[model samples]
Target: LEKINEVIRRAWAVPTHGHELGYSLCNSLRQSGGLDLLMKNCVKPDLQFSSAQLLEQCLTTENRKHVVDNGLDKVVNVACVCTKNSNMEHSRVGTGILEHLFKHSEGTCSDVIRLGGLDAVLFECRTSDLETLRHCASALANLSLYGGAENQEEMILRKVPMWLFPLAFHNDDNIKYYACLAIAVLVANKEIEAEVLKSGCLDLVEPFVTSHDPSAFARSNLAHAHGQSKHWLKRLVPVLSSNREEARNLAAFHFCMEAGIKREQGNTDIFREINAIEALKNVASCPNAIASKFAAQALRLIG
Candidate 1:
């Protein structure tokens, strides 16, 4: 492990513009199976402290170029380990690094895509850490939408199951919404995982629908949850459907403004007391059959 760290250090030590030394080090590390070692030792506290910044720096274009030019197998292996650690560890260092890698991939996204693909690897990373889990999941979902190639739809389909259960049980509703949005995106693509995604949405949204009636804030939240889940439905209309404009307008308002806006207004009685229970109930009954249907139902409730 010490030797692997030494090699990683040397690799990162190279100037951003210089290629030879870092490239050579990355090559040696890949060949020596240093990536495996890095993954294996990722949860160590010392590494969390010592190697965090170095790993972040290594996600840059030049580093990615070196990995690609030399072969990304080692980098992919290292990424796999870090991804696992991010999900498994309580410290969150691994998750942080994973996000950095994805965020930096704008410059070297192709290299990132080549490195075993983000969505598939993240799906394998089953972590109980809610914050880390949500962050990593969101990043993976975003990458699939924005950075994915022709295979993007298939990649998201494979990972939808991994994201479903966690999102359903999440205590933070915002994270739950993120999960809903991610799933909604996949559903929009007409992937096979739409069934599971639809089901999970109903499960997550049901409880919040009507449980609270004290503040408009709760009602707004419930409405927004539905809105977010159903936002994809607008594009599904077969051109000039009579209700298309209304659906688009309602979904946009519920998701984008109504929920947060009402909360900001401090209208406790009229706006804040309503809960998500009703919205959740309609969606949960036959989640797979009509996720969008339920989202439409929730929109009416908000009205």
Candidate 2:
């Protein structure tokens, strides 16, 4: 066990070459019980900094399988307390490791749930550490994907949607997308929670002018969203009417998503006056399943 510590210490001891040295030695690190070493050091009062460095270095595909096969409990423990740590790297890298595990392993979701994984992951969401938030959003996106209806239902009760909406508008594109991605998936199952609406979080849905990517993040995001969001539709109209390609897609996305939340609280008057019927018909002709389903449904509802 001390020998495992010996290798990790020596691996990081080298000045500029430590990471390259550690990268080559990841297998040796694992073979010598390095995962245990990294996990144990992560909780140490002083060792977290280097432990996170070592953990990030070891996250290759082969090592990824090894961690879940035996070391997942360590990740869950790390995720649960990540945000509480003042050391930003530990929170970021540790949660980054958890995100990696959740995305790769199929059964990892419920297995993590068994180890308090959901609470662990969700707790990290309560942070302004941009990287940690994005990683947590990624974990939520994956968790809701693999975690079942009851599992997702649990997130709803915990106010996960409320926590997520603000993130969708984050300045960083990655943060916004993962949050948008998770919201899209979460809203697919049920109504946007009353708490989220009550908090005026629905206004958080506006498109990011910061991201210059080819697809409006919300367009693809809205594609998956099939829930009725009567409250969200007003904001949707603002972006929907814009002249830009991203704006057009983003607008159509909102319509597609909320169309299923189809009752629209009995008002088609706003959508009718907007000339969006023609717009949705245009989106209804797109290739992806997301926009067409939402917009096409929007068309029927508006008509």
Candidate 3:
């Protein structure tokens, strides 16, 4: 155990020369069944955070695959242990590992879910540290994106959307961005979508509709959540005239797509009531060709 710890410490000391050494150490730990011993000792309060972080750094894709293939339950158990304690660093490393495992691939995601890693990551989402929150939210987003229906349903059942709402509206852009991504992915499920909207999750995202500095990914996710709702279109139509070109273009594009979809669904009353036709006409002649094209198509479709 001491030799393994020394190897991890050395890896951290000289990363350039240590990558293969760390990789090899990780493989050997698994082979000799010392990986669990390492994790257990790494969590002790006596050890510096460097120990846990070094172990976390060693958790490369290959090591994660081995962990998944062999004693995945032990990994999940250690993550649970690390996350359960009030140590923020421990929680961060645990959730970070879960994030990597969740994102390794669909197979790894399923393994994590089966081994109860989802709950551990979700629990860490409440951490006060921004980076921890970001990592946990990112993990949830990955799970929502790749996990099976059962996993998705479990997240929704656990009220993951509610947990993410505040982060979506956080003052920090990165947290807001990731939280929005997680919310959007979770609500992709129709059942969760209705629940999220009914829970006023859309209200959290409303402020971003006309944000001067919109994140493209965030806006895209917001659009997916809004999904042709009358309420969103009413708010989006006016954004066509926003001062920021990106806001204006996104609004115009979203307006066109949503309006076109609802029009096909035989619902044009809201479009006319919102004076969308005039807005569409206004953008259809804009200097920006893509925005103009979208507006023109929407106008043609609305008619």
**RMSD in Å for all candidates:** 14.3, 13.9, 13.8
Q: Is candidate 1 or candidate 2 better by lDDT?
A: 2
Model 3 per-residue lDDT tens digits across residues 78-186: 6666777778878877776676666456666767877778778777766679777777776776566556575766666777777777677677655665565555555
Kindly list the per-residue Cα lDDT of model 2 for residues 59-116, writing each as its tens digit.
Answer: 6555667877776776567655554677887677667666656554446666777777
Candidate 2 lDDT at 84 equals 61
Q: Give lDDT for model 2.
A: 0.58
The better candidate by lDDT, 1 or 3, is 3
Mind sharing the TM-score for model 2?
0.53
Model 1 lDDT per residue over 165-226, tens place: 46646676545644544454444444534565446453444445333222343343321221
| lDDT for model 3 | 0.62
Tell how far residue 163 is off in model 3, in angstroms.
1.7
* Winner by TM-score between candidate 3 and candidate 1: 3
**Best first by lDDT, ranked:** 3, 2, 1
In candidate 3, which residue ranges exceed 4 Å CA deviation? 1-52, 105-107, 198-303
Q: Pick the candidate with the highest lDDT.
A: 3
What's the TM-score of every candidate structure? Answer: 0.42, 0.53, 0.53
